[PDB]
Amino acid sequence: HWGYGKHNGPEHWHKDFPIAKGERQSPVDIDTHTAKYDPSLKPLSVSYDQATSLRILNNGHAFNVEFDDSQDKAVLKGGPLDGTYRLIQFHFHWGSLDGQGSEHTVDKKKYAAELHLVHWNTKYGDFGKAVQQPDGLAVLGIFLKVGSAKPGLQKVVDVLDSIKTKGKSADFTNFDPRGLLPESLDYWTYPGSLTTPPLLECVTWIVLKEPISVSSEQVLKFRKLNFNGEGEPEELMVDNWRPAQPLKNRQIKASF
Ligand SMILES: CN[C@H]1C[C@H](C)S(=O)(=O)c2sc(S(N)(=O)=O)cc21
Numbered sequence: 001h002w003g004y005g006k007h008n009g010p011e012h013w014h015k016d017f018p019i020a021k022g023e024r025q026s027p028v029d030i031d032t033h034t035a036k037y038d039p040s041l042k043p044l045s046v047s048y049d050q051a052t053s054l055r056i057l058n059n060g061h062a063f064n065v066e067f068d069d070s071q072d073k074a075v076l077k078g079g080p081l082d083g084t085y086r087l088i089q090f091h092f093h094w095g096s097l098d099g100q101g102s103e104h105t106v107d108k109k110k111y112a113a114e115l116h117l118v119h120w121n122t123k124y125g126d127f128g129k130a131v132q133q134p135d136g137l138a139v140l141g142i143f144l145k146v147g148s149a150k151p152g153l154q155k156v157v158d159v160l161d162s163i164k165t166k167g168k169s170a171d172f173t174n175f176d177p178r179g180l181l182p183e184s185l186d187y188w189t190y191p192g193s194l195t196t197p198p199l200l201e202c203v204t205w206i207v208l209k210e211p212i213s214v215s216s217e218q219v220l221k222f223r224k225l226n227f228n229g230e231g232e233p234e235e236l237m238v239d240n241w242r243p244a245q246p247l248k249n250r251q252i253k254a255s256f
């Protein structure tokens, strides 16, 4: 089954998921000089004050912090979006070394990791129905660069010992996502897909311009995780990111 190694990595995915070669695949390189400023793009409205985190899970390719989405508790609206999208989970993609890790790149520059906050469109009623629609999901992507510690990331970093291997999970309540946001909410946006199998083309990507800083030791603990399940040969969870895909005539719009 798919992964990120030599034999099952991004370049092999088309064999089982033919949409890998589709028309609106993500991630893409964001060229700042070709992105078009769009004056009608509204400001983002992130309402995460009533968020309820539940669990953190190692799923064999990243770790997910999951949220209670049975009511409009943590939602995203405004921006390029029509309607309310609920936060269901967030995860990261990171590298083995600080100069690679992000999925989206800006003028070919790669950051150390990328945070994806995944939201689904409430008019479709549940997550499974939202992935059957071209505007079913909105993912908020935030870049991470090594520098000063991000205090709001530390609670996540400390629980990672408990979910070292594939399939382990831990209770993770009362985590507040607002501590992972940069100061500015300027963004680029384009229509894309999930960046892992099943690679469904249902996503409106909102990639924030401003990165958050994390310390070198915060990023180092991400790299101690395992793709493997307990009692198998250890394979460090590093480089779980997909190379950029062809933009193919889509336009990237900027809110600034
Ligand atoms: C296997 N993980 C995929 C299936 C999950 C059900 S999901 O649709 O929540 C997401 S969102 C996501 S990403 N990297 O594009 O943000 C990847 C996946």
Ligand code: MMC
Pocket: 131, 132, 133, 134, 135, 136, 200, 201, 202, 203
């Ligand atoms: C079409 Hg999702």
Ligand SMILES: [Zn+2]
Pocket: 091, 092, 093, 116, 195
């Ligand atoms: Zn992701």
